[PDB]
RNA sequence: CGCGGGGUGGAGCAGCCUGGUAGCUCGUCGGGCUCAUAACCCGAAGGUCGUCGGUUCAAAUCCGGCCCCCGCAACCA
RNA sequence: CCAUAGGUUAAUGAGGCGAACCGGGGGAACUGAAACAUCUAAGUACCCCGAGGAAAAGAAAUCAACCGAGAUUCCCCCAG
RNA sequence: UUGAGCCUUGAUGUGUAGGAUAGGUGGGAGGCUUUGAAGUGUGGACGCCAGUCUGCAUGGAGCCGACCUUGAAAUACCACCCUUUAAUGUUUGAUGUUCUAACGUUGACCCGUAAUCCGGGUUGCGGACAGUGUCUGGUGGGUAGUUUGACUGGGGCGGUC
């Protein structure tokens, strides 16, 4: 499928250029997010004034700086521990629905945690690393509790 | 029978010619794989047998309409 | 800095990868020449086509509408009192069968040779030394005529010689950096037509595709 | 006959594909080491670089012809 | 679990026998070219699906040649 | 991590003798230059051992040629064009590794089922390849079809249109 680009999704592709993508992937990633669209060749002459010089005017203030010195300097153990017995086996991680859980409900939704692992998912017991959001693009790290008190 | 179940491919008779010209048979036959769909009107990964270039038509018709065409031709899947 | 004071100026002024319209850049080219000596504005065509095959060879001469600004020595082969009239009308030296010996010996100081048809017998065999130099008198351009006092004005009207080099290039002058940019553009137009009129008809690959205009100690731009 | 290579003193092979370029071993003629040879040491003689052209500042080398060798291909009615 | 695989109930149609013709999609062989290689044989046999006294087609995204025509079908012609 | 295709910018050209690092081609006694050149140290590298470069501190307008003499050919300074060579931007590769959405499983367990013939579920293991369907250039004495001139004290070599 030929599509016109709207977002920075290609290293040789630019706003208002035509690229060929498989339709199942275009309908999964590009079209519903307003990042590239079918046809649209008749509208591109306005994209520079309507989008390019609009996004670049926000990128003149957001953030106009490099690196943070708040909430981000530390490393310590957190109140989060892993559920496992004396065989040391986890039997597959339930991740975002168990890692911060305190009630283990069955009639209602268990709230999805916003934490991020450096390895994506947990697999084994012991002293693993986890992180949480401290700003719109910035995450702070901690290690899990193994004393289980 | 190898069926693509959306682009009309079926096992059918025909010629093969390039230059000679010899009576060599072709019998037009496609490639055959399977894909797993999700429709969220039932909690299953729905498996269907398929061939090349069918997903562009499963998008253009919608999966409901593609399974409705199989019933309209009496074709089991 | 490894680059000289004059050279650093033009490295900021042009870059070979960039797009330029020569309808504005031929006026900028007047400012890229940095030689203290007399500079030239030269057209370069990059080849090819084969550099050795004689069937694909391009070698000739042409008249430019504004010339090159270079004053030239022109030789005239004529007999009687018409020799002094041809001198005054444009010839810089007179030819005789004593000068034909210097021509057989390759010793020449002239950019054009003119002949009267009654005197052509002095040089009519000399194609094997005048021809590979672009100097041979030819009736198909009027450098052989009973009216040599007109042909000497056509010789000083501004002519150029061009031949392909083994490297895969051919260079030719289109004027001085003193010229108005529309005189340089009409000389560029004229030269590219003179090379087009010289097309080899059985050659494979590019002939006139890749063209640039450049300057003495300076830099150049693509057409 | 086509295409890419082979042919460089009597016998074998570098050099050619970058124009500044002729070499080496063995034969032959010197000798040397040995009573003496296959080998080993190192000088001298033999130059249409198969064979004929083309072009220049520069081809035995590049682009061709002619005769043989190595190896199988296409370019028509 | 929702479902699916499977199961139960009600209404509806077809199945085979063939005679000859016939529509829809595929389709030889032995010949002949005095071999044989594109071509012929041949859309004939033969196969799957389907049906009526006929079948089928049908209202120009077609012909025509400056004149104009204005669905399909069928016989004598067009034409060896 | 870069073998290759494309991009961009830096760097570069010394057999040897005779003074010299002449890349190639074409110009040229005046031309490079005062916000700039040398040189050898802490410490490195290239190699034809000839010399020379990156970095840095300096010292502070230079300097070459003619004559003499090398070579096809000059020796400042250069338009234009290669060679080699490291990075930059980018696509693509051989490999190592990581994720699992694709793929295999001639693994395991469950359900259909007091049926393991094979479909679905649960799940481990490997992982972007294989398998297949062909496009395409070969090979194929196996397969499928097929060709093989005449005159002749016997065809055989020989004569012959």
Curated annotation (Swiss-Prot), chain A:
Pfam families: Ribosomal_L9_C, Ribosomal_L9_N. The keyword Kinase does not apply. GO terms for biological process: cytoplasmic translation. Coiled coil: none annotated. InterPro entries: Ribosomal_bL9, Ribosomal_bL9/RNase_H1_N, Ribosomal_bL9_bac/chp, Ribosomal_bL9_C, Ribosomal_bL9_C_sf, Ribosomal_bL9_N, Ribosomal_bL9_N_sf. The modification N6-succinyllysine is found at residues 71, 83, 112. Disulfide bonds: none annotated. The modification N6-acetyllysine is found at residue 89. GO terms for cellular component: cytoplasm; cytosol; cytosolic large ribosomal subunit. The keyword Transcription regulation does not apply. GO terms for molecular function: large ribosomal subunit rRNA binding; structural constituent of ribosome. Keywords: Acetylation, Ribonucleoprotein, Ribosomal protein, RNA-binding, rRNA-binding. Gene3D superfamilies: Ribosomal protein L9, C-terminal domain, Ribosomal protein L9, N-terminal domain. Belongs to the bacterial ribosomal protein bL9 family. One of the primary rRNA binding proteins, it binds very close to the 3' end of the 23S rRNA. HAMAP family: Ribosomal_bL9 (MF_00503). Part of the 50S ribosomal subunit. In stalled/collided disomes (pairs of ribosomes where the leading ribosome is stalled and a second ribosome has collided with it) bL9 in the collided ribosome contacts bS6 and uL2, while it contacts only helices of the 16S rRNA in the stalled ribosome; the inter-ribosome bridge thus formed is different from that formed between normally translating ribosomes. This is Large ribosomal subunit protein bL9. It comes from Escherichia coli (strain K12). The gene is rplI.
Curated annotation (Swiss-Prot), chain B:
Keywords: Ribonucleoprotein, Ribosomal protein, RNA-binding, rRNA-binding. Signal peptide: none annotated. GO terms for biological process: cytoplasmic translation; ribosomal large subunit assembly. InterPro entries: Ribosomal_bL28, Ribosomal_bL28/bL31-like_sf, Ribosomal_bL28_bact-type, Ribosomal_bL28_sf. GO terms for molecular function: rRNA binding; structural constituent of ribosome. GO terms for cellular component: cytoplasm; cytosol; cytosolic large ribosomal subunit. Pfam families: Ribosomal_L28. SUPFAM superfamilies: L28p-like. Belongs to the bacterial ribosomal protein bL28 family. HAMAP family: Ribosomal_bL28 (MF_00373). Part of the 50S ribosomal subunit. This is Large ribosomal subunit protein bL28. It comes from Escherichia coli (strain K12).
Curated annotation (Swiss-Prot), chain C:
GO terms for molecular function: rRNA binding; structural constituent of ribosome; tRNA binding. The modification N6-succinyllysine is found at residues 104, 153, 185, 196. Pfam families: Ribosomal_L1. PROSITE patterns: RIBOSOMAL_L1 (PS01199). The keyword Ribosomal protein applies. InterPro entries: Ribosom_uL1_bac-type (IPR005878), Ribosomal_uL1 (IPR002143), Ribosomal_uL1-like (IPR023674), Ribosomal_uL1/biogenesis (IPR028364), Ribosomal_uL1_3-a/b-sand (IPR016095), Ribosomal_uL1_CS (IPR023673). GO terms for cellular component: cytoplasm; cytosol; cytosolic large ribosomal subunit. Transmembrane segments: none annotated. It comes from the Bacteria. The keyword Ribosomal protein applies. GO terms for biological process: cytoplasmic translation; negative regulation of translational initiation; ribosomal large subunit assembly. Keywords: Repressor, Ribonucleoprotein, Ribosomal protein, RNA-binding, rRNA-binding, Translation regulation, tRNA-binding. One of the primary rRNA binding proteins, it binds very close to the 3'-end of the 23S rRNA. Forms part of the L1 stalk. It is often not seen in high-resolution crystal structures, but can be seen in cryo_EM and 3D reconstruction models. These indicate that the distal end of the stalk moves by approximately 20 angstroms. This stalk movement is thought to be coupled to movement of deacylated tRNA into and out of the E site, and thus to participate in tRNA translocation. Contacts the P and E site tRNAs. Part of the 50S ribosomal subunit. Cross-links to the P and E site tRNAs. NCBIfam families: rplA_bact. Belongs to the universal ribosomal protein uL1 family. This is Large ribosomal subunit protein uL1. The lineage of its organism: Bacteria, Pseudomonadati, Pseudomonadota, Gammaproteobacteria, Enterobacterales.
